[PDB]
Design an enzyme around this catalytic site. Structure first.
Site, short mmCIF file in Angstrom:
data_model
loop_
_atom_site.label_atom_id
_atom_site.label_comp_id
_atom_site.label_asym_id
_atom_site.label_seq_id
_atom_site.Cartn_x
_atom_site.Cartn_y
_atom_site.Cartn_z
N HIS A 94 45.77 11.27 70.04
CA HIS A 94 46.92 12.10 69.68
C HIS A 94 47.32 13.09 70.74
CE1 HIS A 94 43.50 14.54 68.44
NE2 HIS A 94 44.27 15.62 68.56
N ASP A 95 48.65 13.25 70.92
CA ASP A 95 49.27 14.22 71.82
C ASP A 95 49.05 13.94 73.32
OD1 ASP A 95 50.12 15.72 69.43
OD2 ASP A 95 48.12 16.54 69.36
N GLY B 227 42.31 12.97 73.32
CA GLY B 227 43.47 13.64 72.74
C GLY B 227 43.96 14.73 73.66
#
Ligand code: VFW
Ligand code: VFW
Ligand code: VFW
Lengths: 256, 256, 256
Positions: free
Chosen positions: C119-120, C137
């Site tokens: 994520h991100d 992440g």
């Protein structure tokens, strides 16, 4: 009941022996050949030109016969022998034909979940590639080698017969036959005496191999010096010749 | 939309609680029992004898309940508790019933993408096995342990309650409760004080655990001498008893 | 024959360009947008909100657009550009919209089997993430970076433009532009001179970068001292400015 599940897709150019089993939602692609007694599980993707031999087992989520990364349309091939087990999520790539670099796997091998066999790799017989072992490409794995879980093998490395790697080993150089290696970067520790005993080697052969390891690794000799000293023992024991030949054919130097 | 997708394959001997959801192209094999509120995603392979509890979530491309690597036809089992999340591509093998060594997973565990749980392993409650963590077999993971991505655990290793491994750790020895380990090969660094504070441990218990780590790792004591020195603190603090007990039960020695 | 296989599942809220190909048993989830010329293989799971651009190829057993681990219902997105290749079993998670932290992939990238994009994370253009590379992440990968097989990247790390990691590297700090890193924990070894030559860098630019590496890693200077000595060279050569800027913007320190 039907050997070929009705939910499987079999390309018209594929050639299968009559008793081949193919599970649901599997794809047997163009130019795939499958021999007698082979069982393809569900969710398998097979791509060719690939030859799969007899009495093999390929488990779900595997991609076998994927593309090689010289010219467009250059013939490539993957050849798999008999009595192999390819577990879930295994990826095996094809290799180039014209330079004799096809990807080839022999007999009685066990390739465990998510292992990766890169293009132009050659695996012998009775090998074990444990979960997530990755062969970058052009790797040669000789008979009875065992690569523990998450072993990484650099392109062009040679893994000797009856050798063993510890889990998470990162192999950047050749592994001589019988040698045990561990760590990242991999380092030679000893010889696989346990494997020799299971294989029925004589106590005399094991003794000659223990001395051979010392000549190469513990007596400060250069590779040329060690090779010269091993000639005599190698001429007498075929097992020592296997060791000597693996050091002689090392192109990336030997793991130390 | 039907709870059991019509494109899934459900064996007649499987037993699913009335509200169980199964996605398309999933296989729920013979002798698989699934409890209330469990959601099976698409492309999942479930093999038995396996018991899955309540409110679990199993994501696509997982193979749960695969065969264990003494005799042909020996009953084997996999038991999964409640409120667990098994992400994509996870592989979980069954274990032998006869010797009370089945593979067991407790409650509230998070088993992330491509993690591997080998035969006869036992995971407690509230554990986190991050992407590609691999338990070789016969591994015991106690409550609240966190194994960071790509942690490798040797067969028979015991991972203590509230312990932590850094990414890519290769664990060959037992990890005592609360201990943080890092590297390949794994080395003990400290204690998971952050985890103790999240769990609401008192300042006094944390202080006693900090002193306990020093007794074992920083004062040149042997394991036997350390165990004797911790006896008093262990009787007074149940958390120190957890730490002492994990060192007492360490059959492969402790990670240093 | 049909571009969208009749055995695929296309959610009614998904938006596809007319010529998109979707193979059998693939799921194009709600809120997934797919651009002209993209080919989705069989057994692919796409989840949204996700935008996939033009001329992409996504292979079997991939899970693209999976949930990110502030509040329930917070909008999250994954954006993939054009001309990317996502190989088998890749996992890509979405990221949060509110804080401009969506997971973003640019153009002409190659994300190889079983790679993981947490994520991100932000991947630029012309990157190569080799098999089983894992970005925990919030990782930023700049243009032309190559991460060799099984590279692990800690959350919040920055991988500089044209940098390179050896197989099995465990990156815990920032990797400056052009730097080559190896091992677990990762260590700086040299500059990516091969990459510089492939890009047609001048002899002066290649020499000024070799001088720059020595200033930062070989002359016993502190980061603040090295940044000062690079200022003149960075002004004359834009490629040395790229190196200097990556060191200046390092928040976790530089890999050494
Ligand atoms: C943590 C990484 C990991 C992940 C998964 C398994 C093991 C793993 O590491 C351990 C490991 O690789 N071996 C030790 C071991 O599991 N012995 C049983 C070598 C080995 C030798 C032989 C065989 N098999 C022979 N027939 C069937 N399997 C299996 C392994
Ligand atoms: C590169 C290998 C790698 C690959 C993938 C992810 C992380 C990876 O490495 C980092 C890592 O393993 N952790 C740090 C981290 O990502 N924290 C968020 C531990 C950790 C602790 C808790 C959780 N949770 C997720 N859901 C609930 N808890 C996740 C991770
Ligand atoms: C054992 C881990 C491992 C597993 C799988 C592959 C390689 C592996 O390690 C080797 C490795 O990561 N590289 C060296 C190598 O294979 N070069 C050909 C970097 C690399 C650089 C570029 C590319 N590609 C460029 N276009 C297409 N692919 C591929 C790899």
């Amino acid at each position: 009941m039907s050997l070929i599940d009705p939910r499987a897709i079999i390309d018209p150019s594929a050639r299968l022996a009559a008793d081949v089993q193919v599970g649901p939602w599997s794809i047997v692609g163009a130019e795939v050949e499958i021999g007698e007694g082979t069982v393809i599980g569900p969710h398998v993707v097979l791509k060719g030109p690939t030859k799969i031999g007899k009495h093999n087992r390929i488990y779900q989520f595997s991609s076998v016969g994927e593309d090689t990364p010289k010219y467009k349309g250059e013939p490539t091939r993957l050849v798999i022998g008999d009595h192999n087990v390819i577990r879930e999520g295994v990826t095996i790539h094809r290799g180039t034909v014209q330079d004799r670099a096809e990807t080839t796997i022999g007999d009685h091998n066990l390739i465990m979940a998510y292992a990766h066999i890169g293009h132009d790799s050659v695996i012998g017989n009775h090998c074990i590639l444990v979960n997530n072992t990755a062969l970058a490409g052009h790797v040669h794995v000789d008979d009875w080698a065992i690569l523990s879980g998450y072993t990484l093998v650099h392109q062009y490395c040679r893994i000797g017969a009856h050798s063993f790697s510890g889990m998470g080993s990162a192999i950047g150089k050749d592994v001589p036959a019988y040698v045990t290696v561990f760590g990242n970067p991999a380092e030679a520790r000893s010889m696989n005496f346990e494997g020799m005993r299971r294989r029925g080697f004589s106590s005399e052969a094991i003794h000659a191999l223990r001395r051979a390891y010392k000549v190469v690794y513990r007596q400060g000799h250069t590779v040329e010096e060690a090779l010269a000293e091993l000639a005599e023992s190698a001429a007498q024991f075929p097992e020592v010749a296997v060791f000597r030949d693996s050091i002689q054919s090392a192109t990336r130097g030997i793991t130390r």
